[PDB]
Amino acid sequence: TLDVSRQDPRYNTLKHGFNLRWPSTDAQAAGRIALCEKADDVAPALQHIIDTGMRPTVRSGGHCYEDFVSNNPDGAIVDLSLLNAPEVRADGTVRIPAGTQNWNGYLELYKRHNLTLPGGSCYSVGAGGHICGGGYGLLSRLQGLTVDWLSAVDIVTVDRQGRAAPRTVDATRDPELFRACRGAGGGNFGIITAYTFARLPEAPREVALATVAFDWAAMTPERFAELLRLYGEYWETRGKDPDTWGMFSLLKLTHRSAGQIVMLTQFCNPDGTCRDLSVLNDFLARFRACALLCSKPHTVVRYDWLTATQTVNGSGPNQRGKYKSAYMKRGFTAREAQRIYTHLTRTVPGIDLSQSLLQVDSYGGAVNKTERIADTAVPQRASVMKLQYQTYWTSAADDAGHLRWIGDFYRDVYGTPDVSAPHAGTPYPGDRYEGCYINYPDVDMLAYPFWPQLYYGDGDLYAFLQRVKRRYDPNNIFHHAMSVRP
Ligand SMILES: *Cc1cc2c(nc3c(=O)[nH]c(=O)nc-3n2C[C@H](O)[C@H](O)[C@H](O)COP(=O)(O)OP(=O)(O)OC[C@H]2O[C@@H](n3cnc4c(N)ncnc43)[C@H](O)[C@@H]2O)c(*)c1C
């Protein structure tokens, strides 16, 4: 372990992660970062921190949207980012240590055994937060969530007597903690050192990437509603069919100041080839090219899968971000389409909303296996679209404008009629929505006493997680603004 305290030249860099908002103040910053050099460092590093009464937060790839890692006033960040070399065995079993970044992981899994894991696209996201939060990406309609493949988890927990020790959890060993590690989100129960997979799916051989853009200059409320109708009605119907599960679409409903709305679709057949583009052609044909809604000319480019996966792996700039999430079981209502149009066309004097957007992901397919409700901590297994509201900016001086823009936008979309008065402002689970995604955490939801039901559903999961919390972190060593409460 390397100790990076405030005397160390690395401190100013290592006190933060990807989102430059955190820590908000120097007072809130960690006093030190414990950079673990091997898995065997983790329990002793943790033991040293808690033995002094200091609080640990936990970092792997640093991508947390919220202050969960970096807001730890004069505490210790236990950093597992150097624990990054996957083990891909000749028998196809895989171990992904927590610091493995998504793209490095895809390269290793692909080259060593023609395997992949259906997680996120961003190159720099770490396994540690990503997988236990229920990570998904462009292959998840085909192959399900990252957590749907997990066979075992190596985790350091702290017992009632305050002793940190490694354990391995799986279907028969601490099975309730295993289930919690399959989606509940990080920084809750202990420090995951590695994820084990008895089997992974084969990497696809070939994909097509289709880009369809729409000029904002021509985008009326009616054309915008037609775009949302065509897209959402597809995922609610045809997109449930298995022959479509290799198709994954990102509709970037940009703020008007971005100039264009962009839809990026990846496609393979279920067998991982592009032997038949019919499903993609049929999907794209719903979006008529100009040369009433009409698009810029469609671009469809074929790649081998690894090459496409590299070309889409960007993380965007290192800057300030605010994010929100919603799971949709249905197409857009006319009221949703109108409220979204309102906020995407709203001018806010003194701030640049050109990087801001509502992203609407195709969802469901192989995710939507109800047997995973009982053995994972991802209860949202009936959604057809997954939404990520995003605003990005450079300067702390502009925080208030950006937070207000995205806060008002979200509250309005999920307001009265489509949502009950008691839950208004949230995509509360029911006939229309399935709530929120813990890997896109939103501390604005702490304003609502029912925030745990947004993330963990209206059923018994949160109480289950509270029981795991009492059993495996009885001292509440591991916490943050949205951690499972004892
Ligand atoms: C920055 C970023 C995030 C993205 C991106 N694209 C995603 C995508 O395509 N699919 C997704 O499903 N999610 C995407 N996300 C969001 C990420 O999934 C989340 O931001 C992950 O939680 C990030 O994980 P990581 O990079 O490890 O982030 P940290 O900030 O280190 O920790 C997050 C969270 O988890 C806890 N924690 C970290 N490490 C551990 C370990 N080893 N054990 C337990 N708990 C751990 C932290 O306490 C914190 O709560 C694309 C981009 C650009």
Side-chain angles (χ1 to χ4, degrees), residues 1-159 161-287 289-486:
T1 308
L2 303 170
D3 181 37
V4 179
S5 73
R6 285 176 176 279
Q7 74 170 75
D8 188 282
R10 296 162 291 196
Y11 172 84
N12 283 348
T13 299
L14 292 185
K15 71 194 297 200
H16 71 80
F18 188 71
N19 190 342
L20 293 180
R21 293 172 68 203
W22 321 119
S24 289
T25 69
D26 204 16
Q28 290 177 334
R32 61 184 294 249
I33 302 96
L35 278 172
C36 294
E37 295 173 272
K38 55 188 188 178
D40 282 346
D41 284 349
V42 174
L46 182 54
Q47 190 70 68
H48 173 82
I49 293 160
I50 67 185
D51 280 357
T52 77
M54 189 177 312
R55 176 182 169 212
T57 51
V58 188
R59 183 162 64 203
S60 301
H63 269 265
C64 196
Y65 288 2
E66 294 289 13
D67 75 358
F68 303 163
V69 181
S70 278
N71 175 358
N72 184 0
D74 197 39
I77 298 172
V78 183
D79 178 312
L80 279 67
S81 69
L82 297 173
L83 304 190
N84 60 20
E87 295 171 48
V88 180
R89 294 188 199 89
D91 69 1
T93 63
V94 175
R95 175 86 124 329
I96 302 180
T100 308
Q101 296 181 19
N102 283 9
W103 169 243
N104 290 332
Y106 297 151
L107 281 165
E108 288 281 330
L109 291 173
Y110 178 85
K111 287 178 181 176
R112 289 175 174 279
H113 207 279
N114 195 38
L115 304 174
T116 200
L117 184 76
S121 60
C122 300
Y123 78 105
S124 56
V125 161
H130 179 67
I131 297 175
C132 72
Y136 81 99
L138 292 177
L139 292 181
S140 294
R141 277 170 45 78
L142 185 61
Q143 301 174 345
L145 302 178
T146 51
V147 296
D148 299 338
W149 294 89
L150 271 177
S151 304
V153 178
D154 294 341
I155 183 173
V156 174
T157 62
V158 178
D159 72 10
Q161 297 70 44
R163 299 327 286 165
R167 63 179 66 232
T168 298
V169 307
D170 75 358
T172 64
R173 294 179 281 181
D174 294 310
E176 304 200 340
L177 181 53
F178 179 53
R179 174 179 184 205
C181 288
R182 298 181 76 176
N188 271 312
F189 308 111
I191 301 182
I192 296 172
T193 59
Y195 295 99
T196 296
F197 303 85
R199 174 61 37 71
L200 283 179
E202 285 203 306
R205 281 174 272 180
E206 193 168 1
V207 299
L209 293 182
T211 308
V212 179
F214 306 86
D215 215 299
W216 260 116
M219 191 55 67
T220 60
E222 294 81 6
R223 288 171 195 155
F224 189 85
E226 186 189 353
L227 171 59
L228 275 52
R229 185 186 108 274
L230 286 165
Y231 187 80
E233 288 190 349
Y234 186 91
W235 306 111
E236 182 179 43
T237 60
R238 186 69 178 96
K240 295 179 168 164
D241 294 337
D243 63 337
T244 74
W245 287 8
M247 194 162 70
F248 202 104
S249 198
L250 319 175
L251 176 59
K252 298 189 178 156
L253 301 175
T254 54
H255 185 273
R256 179 152 65 186
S257 62
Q260 296 194 134
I261 291 168
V262 182
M263 187 181 61
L264 175 66
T265 307
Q266 183 179 95
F267 180 85
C268 57
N269 299 118
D271 65 7
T273 77
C274 285
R275 68 185 161 89
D276 179 8
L277 292 194
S278 296
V279 165
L280 177 65
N281 295 333
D282 168 81
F283 170 71
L284 294 174
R286 302 159 69 83
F287 313 98
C290 305
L292 182 50
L293 169 74
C294 69
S295 70
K296 297 298 189 110
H298 295 14
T299 293
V300 183
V301 177
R302 283 175 66 159
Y303 297 89
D304 59 65
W305 171 80
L306 188 68
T307 304
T309 302
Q310 188 171 25
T311 213
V312 302
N313 77 3
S315 289
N318 299 71
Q319 70 187 340
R320 303 173 82 83
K322 177 66 190 167
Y323 314 78
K324 309 182 163 272
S325 75
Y327 283 107
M328 284 179 80
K329 299 168 68 167
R330 314 284 169 210
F332 288 95
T333 72
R335 196 169 292 109
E336 284 175 309
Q338 189 49 54
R339 291 164 176 173
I340 292 164
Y341 183 85
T342 290
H343 292 274
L344 291 182
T345 57
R346 176 168 291 180
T347 297
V348 179
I351 70 165
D352 181 354
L353 284 173
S354 66
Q355 292 197 78
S356 302
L357 69 152
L358 169 56
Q359 188 170 326
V360 189
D361 289 3
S362 63
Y363 206 66
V367 176
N368 286 3
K369 294 303 190 177
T370 59
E371 49 266 50
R372 293 297 71 81
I373 298 169
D375 69 356
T376 77
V378 182
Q380 301 93 346
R381 304 295 188 151
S383 295
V384 300
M385 294 182 286
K386 184 167 182 171
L387 277 58
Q388 189 183 188
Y389 296 74
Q390 296 165 65
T391 189
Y392 301 102
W393 69 105
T394 302
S395 175
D398 291 347
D399 287 0
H402 281 274
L403 299 179
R404 177 194 321 118
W405 175 77
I406 197 173
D408 285 350
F409 178 3
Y410 189 88
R411 270 187 292 279
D412 192 18
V413 175
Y414 304 111
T416 35
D418 301 350
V419 175
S420 74
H423 299 323
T426 73
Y428 191 88
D431 200 60
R432 184 167 294 286
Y433 303 113
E434 298 200 290
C436 302
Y437 174 44
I438 195 60
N439 269 335
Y440 301 162
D442 174 9
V443 293
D444 293 349
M445 301 296 101
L446 293 173
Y448 307 93
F450 53 82
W451 69 268
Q453 285 71 224
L454 296 178
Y455 289 95
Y456 302 123
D458 215 15
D460 62 21
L461 181 55
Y462 187 56
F464 169 88
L465 296 173
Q466 292 186 292
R467 298 195 299 282
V468 170
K469 179 63 178 186
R470 176 202 38 74
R471 175 168 177 189
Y472 293 101
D473 188 17
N475 301 298
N476 195 33
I477 300 299
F478 299 101
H479 62 268
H480 58 67
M482 305 186 74
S483 62
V484 174
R485 301 278 130 83

